[PDB]
């Protein structure tokens, strides 16, 4: 019929994709953490920091086939694209039976006694069977497990002092019927079943805070283009918009900017540190039709 | 203002920014998070229209 009808919505598509990251030529030593000369225990695990480097995770793929490679809060294939503010690495060696217990929100003896992950865990868990690498017939004493703990552990809590757990209220020392010896450190021979076979295991704990510190993956920086609709990726902040010169007096501390509503409205270039305003053209579309019984022309 | 500000809410999702969800996760879990967000935003729009 004759009239004006709103039908669809128009938008102006981007013509280029821009990615900007700081010039960091270092490489993160994940494969050195995983390939430890001597391995820490689940009882006492090696927390090591990884920072100010390029988080290249293909080195892991080339470095081994893996018994397990599971990422809970992040996709296993997309690590090389993201930017991780505070990537921690927790390395140890563990029995196979308990490898399934390294997962958030799960219940199990090793979760209660030795090492637990939070319910709100963002990260990855990686495991490679260690029989063909370190395990001697005499047995390695890298393994160490808390047979019994007085109280359950919090996420990422460590407790090292060995003290005997008492059956009752009276103190016990060395008398088996009333003494629960806190540890079962034991070197295991390659011939044991799979449930006891060792596994070198590394847990990567990623905290995502839009990268104040970067340690960003191996993305390739491209030239900054302004006054055009583009798909921008500034230091992990992805979006689509027009980047223009900013007249806002940021402090040197601040990076991201925001409007009265929480929409990002300004950013800092990771390389040149220039403040750029992000302007979103989009709108409705109305078709003005005289009516098809009169004419097929339309505005 | 309230309608625009409801976008910053998570409604239980890991993040309120859809681009973060699509950049971090594979489809079969990004769908769960995006469905949580869709439910929240649909509720906001229905309230605004009413």
């Amino acid at each position: 019929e004759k009239g004006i009808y709103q039908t669809s919505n128009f938008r102006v598509q981007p013509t280029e994709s821009i990615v900007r990251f700081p010039n960091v030529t270092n490489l993160c030593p994940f494969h050195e953490v995983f390939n430890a000369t001597r391995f820490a225990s689940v009882y006492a695990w090696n927390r090591t920091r990884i920072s100010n480097c390029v988080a290249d995770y293909s080195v892991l793929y080339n470095f081994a086939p893996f018994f397990a490679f599971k990422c809970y809060g992040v996709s296993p294939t997309k690590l090389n694209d993201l930017c991780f503010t505070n990537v921690y690495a927790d390395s140890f060696v563990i029995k196979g039976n308990e490898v399934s217990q390294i997962a958030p929100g799960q219940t199990g003896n090793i979760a209660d006694y030795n090492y637990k992950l939070p319910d709100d865990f963002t990260g990855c868990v990686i495991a490679w069977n260690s029989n063909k690498l370190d395990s001697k017939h005499s047995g390695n004493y890298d393994y160490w497990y808390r047979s019994l703990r007085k109280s359950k552990l919090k996420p990422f809590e460590r407790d090292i002092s060995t003290e005997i757990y008492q059956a009752g209220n009276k103190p016990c020392k060395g008398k088996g019927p009333n003494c629960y010896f806190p540890l079962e450190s034991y070197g295991f021979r390659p011939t044991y079943g799979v449930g006891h076979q060792p596994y070198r295991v590394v847990v990567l704990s990623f905290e995502l805070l839009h990268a104040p510190a970067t340690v960003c993956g191996p993305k390739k920086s491209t030239n900054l283009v302004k006054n055009k609709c583009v798909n921008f990726n500034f230091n992990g902040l992805t979006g689509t918009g027009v980047l223009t010169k900013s007249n806002k007096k940021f402090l040197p501390f601040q990076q991201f900017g925001r409007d009265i509503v929480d929409t990002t409205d300004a950013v800092r270039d990771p390389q040149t540190l220039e403040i750029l305003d992000i302007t979103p053209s989009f709108g409705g579309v109305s078709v003005i039709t005289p009516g098809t019984n009169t004419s097929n022309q339309v505005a | 203002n309230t309608l625009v500000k409801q976008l910053s809410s998570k409604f239980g999702a890991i993040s309120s920014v859809l681009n973060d969800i699509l950049s971090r996760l594979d489809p079969p879990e990004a769908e769960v998070q995006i469905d949580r967000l869709i439910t929240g935003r649909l509720q906001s729009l229905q309230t605004y229209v009413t």
Binding site: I260 | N1, L3, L7
Partner: peptide, 29 residues
């Protein structure tokens, strides 16, 4: 006299109450 042909009272009324969609735009027009 004025560019808008409005009475003085209309000018007072219009002054008292207060194409880029700078504010609130997340599909809202």
């Amino acid at each position: 006299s004025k560019p808008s042909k409005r009475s003085p009272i209309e000018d007072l009324l219009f002054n008292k109450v207060t194409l880029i969609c700078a504010q609130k735009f997340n599909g809202l027009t």
